[PDB]
Design a protein around this nucleic acid. Structure first.
Ligand SMILES: O=C(O)CCC(=O)C(=O)O
Ligand SMILES: O=C(O)CCC(=O)C(=O)O
Ligand SMILES: [Co+2]
Ligand SMILES: [Co+2]
Lengths: 207, 207
DNA sequence: TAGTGCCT
DNA sequence: GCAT
């Protein structure tokens, strides 16, 4: 079934942890996306991102003229983001628990969609005010190479092949570690067809 | 010397700084000879009954302007005195004993309470990195330390903290409400008629 | 700012 | 490493 692969202090890959729940989540990805479509956000410096994005839950990650921000409102629809699906919340809390983060209460889910070539540059998740809360990151569909630092931009990166069902969780000592996804290679998956989805759960607000 | 549970992520290290107390006080005096103890007025207009100074990279002060973490002491227009080795060793030993092996303070606020002096119920919420615990050292006269929950009105535990007692809280109890009741007059051989507290914090960003 | 691209 |  599902196994573990430690990464760094506070960081684990829960291999295939989400494999069983994958269909229900992908279904929910569609339902979220029907309310708040995937869009390729433009960074504050004017770059269009290659990853296409949407959000569900109380707070959604968004780009804005003044920098990267969490908003209760989808500027694409000027409505609040969709409620977080029960399957999202359930899988997430299970993972955070299996990962040794017992009381994770996410208020934010970023949905990433990678088409072939799409990537996400090395970066830290530092837009969140409460650093105690872990990051839970679910991989679905096409395989990708995830790199994992690194408190500095340039200390050794681990390069991990993340497959459909894999969940990476990080936090505590590794909460601000650099990470990213290399240009997605083309392929097929039965459940996602031609792309890779990622679900990043966070506590983006304040307890 | 010994441990007592206080809350999730919080312990009392009874008499933990008893052995080092004489050196800590000498180190207080030296720190004070550069950045003297001073009164502070809060944004409310009330002068605090506690006198304060700081040592370490970042010092906390409050004003009718608002509180401030700064590398400069407003009274001297110079950096706060560097963190004394005794302070740094004791803090780290305390934090490891309390389950926080990686605590690196960059800030120590020194409080001096005279009889009648108090510190109103509050949260330590000014620090951006909430993963770092608070290490809280008692010296001299005994005081009642209030320790509650996340909300202002959550039930309060009245704890009698005595010379050498160290309190450590973090994780789930990190933002818990707490405070000091008006100090009763008394005598202590090492402080005469007053109580010192060392509050160690990570006030800036961790490396 | 840069969650990008090395711009010529 | 750096641009702004
Ligand atoms: O797609 C991934 O696996 C990583 C996602 C990510 O870095 C993010 O959402 O911040
Ligand atoms: O004197 C004490 O033990 C409490 C000090 C405190 O709560 C503070 O400085 O914020
Ligand atoms: Co990220
Ligand atoms: Co306090």
């Amino acid at each position: 079934e599902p196994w573990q692969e430690p990464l760094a202090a506070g960081a684990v890959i829960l291999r295939r942890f989400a494999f069983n729940a994958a269909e229900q989540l992908i279904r929910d990805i569609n339902d979220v996306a029907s309310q708040s479509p995937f869009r390729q956000m433009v960074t504050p410096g004017g770059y269009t991102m290659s990853v296409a994005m949407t959000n569900c839950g109380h707070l959604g990650w968004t780009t804005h003229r003044q920098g990267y921000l969490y908003s209760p409102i989808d500027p694409q629809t000027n409505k609040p983001w969709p409620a977080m699906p029960q399957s999202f919340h359930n899988l997430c809390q299970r993972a955070a628990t299996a990962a040794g983060y017992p009381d994770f209460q996410p208020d934010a889910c970023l949905i990433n969609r990678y088409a072939p070539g799409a990537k996400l540059s090395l970066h830290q998740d530092k837009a969140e005010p409460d650093l105690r809360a872990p990051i839970v990151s679910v991989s679905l569909g096409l395989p990708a190479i995830f790199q994992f630092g690194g408190l500095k931009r340039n200390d050794p990166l681990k390069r991990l092949l993340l497959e459909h069902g894999d969940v990476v969780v990080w936090g505590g000592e590794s909460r601000l570690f650099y990470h990213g996804i290399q240009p997605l290679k083309a392929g097929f998956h039965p459940l996602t067809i031609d792309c890779r989805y990622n679900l990043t759960f966070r506590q983006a607000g304040k307890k």
